[PDB]
Write a protein that binds this ligand. Structure first.
Ligand code: 5WV
Length: 107
């Protein structure tokens, strides 16, 4: 209940503090990304996730992991594989899986 909240908040904070998190900190701007919102149907970012967390949306580990996973998969679908964004996604995704395992969210 509140142990879930505290674990998620800690995980989410560590992810947001990571050096490769900078591309994901806020919603993608239509302005900077031609045809993003036609192709990416469930956009996600770490600011929206902070809100969802604060709003007590993450009642299960699955809902949290789906959202954060979506951040990475959206990025990898949209961007070229050797783009800096794609590289950041995979670095931070590694970090993400490391932290969820460390906390026994993958039980
Ligand atoms: C994760 N991001 C951030 C961003 C900014 C501009 C264009 C694409 C992206 C993207 O996939």
């Amino acid at each position: 209940p509140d142990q879930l909240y505290s674990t998620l908040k800690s995980i989410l904070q560590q992810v947001k503090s990571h050096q490769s998190a900078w591309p994901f900190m806020e919603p993608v701007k239509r302005t900077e990304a031609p045809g993003y919102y036609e192709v990416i149907r469930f956009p996600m970012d770490l600011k929206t996730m902070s809100e969802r967390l604060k709003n007590r949306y993450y009642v299960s580990k699955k809902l949290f992991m789906a959202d954060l996973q979506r951040v990475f998969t959206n990025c990898k679908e949209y961007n070229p594989p050797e783009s800096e964004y794609y590289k950041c996604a995979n670095i931070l995704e590694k970090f993400f899986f490391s932290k969820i395992k460390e906390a026994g969210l993958i039980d």
